[PDB]
Design a protein around this ligand. Sequence first.
Ligand code: RET
Ligand code: RET
Ligand code: RET
Ligand code: D12
Ligand code: D12
Ligand code: D12
Ligand code: D12
Ligand code: D12
Ligand code: D12
Ligand code: D12
Ligand code: D12
Ligand code: D12
Lengths: 210, 210, 210
Amino acid sequence: NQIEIVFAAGIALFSVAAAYFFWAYKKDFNSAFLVSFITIISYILMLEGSLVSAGARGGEVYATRWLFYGLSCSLLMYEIARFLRKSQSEIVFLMFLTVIVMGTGGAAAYFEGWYKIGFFVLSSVAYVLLVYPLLTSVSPNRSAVAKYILLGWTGFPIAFLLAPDGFGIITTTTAAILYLLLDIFTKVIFYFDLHRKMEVNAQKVLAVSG
Amino acid sequence: NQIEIVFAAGIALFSVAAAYFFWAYKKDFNSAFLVSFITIISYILMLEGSLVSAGARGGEVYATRWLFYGLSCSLLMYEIARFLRKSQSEIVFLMFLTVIVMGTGGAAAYFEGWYKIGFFVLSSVAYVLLVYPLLTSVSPNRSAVAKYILLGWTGFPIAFLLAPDGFGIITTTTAAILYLLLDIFTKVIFYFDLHRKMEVNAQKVLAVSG
Amino acid sequence: NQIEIVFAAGIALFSVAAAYFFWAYKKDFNSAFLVSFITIISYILMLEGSLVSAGARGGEVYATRWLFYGLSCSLLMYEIARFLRKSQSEIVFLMFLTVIVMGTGGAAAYFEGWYKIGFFVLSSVAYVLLVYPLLTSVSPNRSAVAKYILLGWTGFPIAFLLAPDGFGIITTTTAAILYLLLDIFTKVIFYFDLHRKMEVNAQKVLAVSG
Ligand SMILES: *C\C=C(C)/C=C/C=C(C)/C=C/C1=C(C)CCCC1(C)C
Ligand SMILES: *C\C=C(C)/C=C/C=C(C)/C=C/C1=C(C)CCCC1(C)C
Ligand SMILES: *C\C=C(C)/C=C/C=C(C)/C=C/C1=C(C)CCCC1(C)C
Ligand SMILES: CCCCCCCCCCCC
Ligand SMILES: CCCCCCCCCCCC
Ligand SMILES: CCCCCCCCCCCC
Ligand SMILES: CCCCCCCCCCCC
Ligand SMILES: CCCCCCCCCCCC
Ligand SMILES: CCCCCCCCCCCC
Ligand SMILES: CCCCCCCCCCCC
Ligand SMILES: CCCCCCCCCCCC
Ligand SMILES: CCCCCCCCCCCC
């Protein structure tokens, strides 16, 4: 009952964000639009109940959340890594790491016992490899970005461990509200905050070889 | 009984098209070959009955059709967008839209009630965003292409609404014949018609910077 | 019992290989690391028993093995094709073929009767198209590479036909040991053997236009 309302709020908010982002930005590759549109699909699937499995302490796990993050967060990571002027091959690497983090997180959420532990460890290893080059970047853009990695991206494995995906210390519904707050921060606030600086950065890189 | 014959015809025709396209074209990236080869796989899976679900008015839905279109139609969209000399980042955007249209169409086909409606709406929104830059292109190549978008690509959501995927006004078998006709048009006739002009266009773009 | 030990050995070995490859190579796009990390995930899923189906002569089939090869072997194929200085569009083509080979091989393994035969034929056709430009390459690098294609990549369809995936002449456990030997050869020995020559090749291509 309660969790349907959370998922409905997610559908509504990301529909508004997608419509806004498409209208506000240039009518070309709009990662902000795609990230939100994909998240709409993900929230509808969770509302539908398409793959709900038993979590810890009697909660539920919605492992398609994590699988769709493999797509939307790769777009986010493209923006972040470009913003920090990583090389093209490091951008691709970081995007691969991102997909791996999300895919193994979905496995860790769904599976049990030692499989959950094993997949959570692999996800965490790839995640350390993902954020270390972001957090240690010498780019002047590192601090604008660090707050998304530290409070947003890193909030997810913390929420995961508390949630039925992990130990089940908090309920399914409270976990879902937490994931929705983190989604708004990493997928919507991120662009309101950084869209213009990222576009200006993209123009400077285009104009200046090297 | 009848629908097995339709799917068998699809297997046979796309096997011949793939063999022809591989032989006829250069032994390099051959999108025509890949589009047909992928469609072969899709028809075998539908003949096998791998994920058949109940549609409207007592028909059947073969939602893997739509999922495989996310792969083969991205290759088609690459050809179309390149043909109209869209920028590299607009090509990628249009390819993303294409995958979204097909993925949400497969969800709309499979799911029911308000979920079918919701996913059909999201698919239609992405589809309007996909074809608007194609149909309004100033490229001299726009008219050669418009007939595929207007009669072929747009025939699919019309067939979908009539089919058990949508309202079920026509039977599963009649829908499948219609989808096969649309497949031959958008995946085979398309290349017989446009292959040479697309290759010439690709050569001119390679030779002339700007 | 016995096969759990094989899968555990795979988990252990690829974890060591991934850790070694990440440490040994440059902290940038590391295909050797990703190939091994992905294979870890695949072995954990097979140990878990996530999609086990009945094979021939009373064996078992682990069709997720083949599906994950579509990802790890595309990275390998990127390295191989680059090593032979194939053009960018031929590299993409070969990578598409690779995904098709693995995807249809997973279908052939899982399905039965004429579907197994049909999908094995399609996989074999794409595989001939994949290796013919590798085996006939005029690159001086062709011979270093030919032993991986001839003994490793081609060992898989042979093992497949013997295994419960195919005729079931050998048991599930013996097939799994054979696949693990082939994995170590094509994914680990490959890099110990060829890593330096591939990096030197990549530097020469970067430095010399044409
Ligand atoms: C929705 C938007 C974003 C940026 C989501 C990010 C998610 C993560 C960083 C999740 C990480 C995980 C870790 C590191 C390990 C356990 C499994 C998780 C997938 C929750
Ligand atoms: C097989 C070849 C092609 C070009 C297929 C194209 C399919 C579509 C354009 C389908 C579109 C859909 C729409 C717009 C909305 C409902 C769901 C559909 C997937 C049928
Ligand atoms: C794990 C690493 C590698 C390089 C795996 C390669 C696998 C193949 C070349 C498999 C080929 C198949 C063929 C050609 C036809 C039957 C199905 C297979 C997938 C086994
Ligand atoms: C303009 C360039 C955007 C690049 C988008 C890359 C596509 C990411 C797909 C990841 C699939 C899991
Ligand atoms: C500049 C565009 C880079 C696109 C990066 C692609 C990442 C692909 C990851 C695929 C993993 C499934
Ligand atoms: C059922 C008792 C009412 C629950 C009130 C808590 C809901 C507020 C959640 C808001 C999260 C932003
Ligand atoms: C020669 C360039 C061809 C580009 C092919 C792009 C690959 C599309 C994959 C889409 C996956 C759903
Ligand atoms: C010039 C090659 C452009 C390739 C476009 C890639 C599209 C990736 C879409 C991935 C969505 C799942
Ligand atoms: C069962 C009665 C015969 C059905 C004849 C209609 C089949 C012709 C379909 C051709 C579609 C191109
Ligand atoms: C440095 C360039 C590496 C290119 C990696 C391509 C991504 C392959 C994804 C294939 C998905 C099945
Ligand atoms: C130089 C990087 C080339 C990357 C090749 C992408 C191959 C995409 C195959 C997608 C099939 C699902
Ligand atoms: C159960 C009888 C012992 C089986 C011994 C064979 C195991 C050796 C396999 C090693 C493969 C490299």
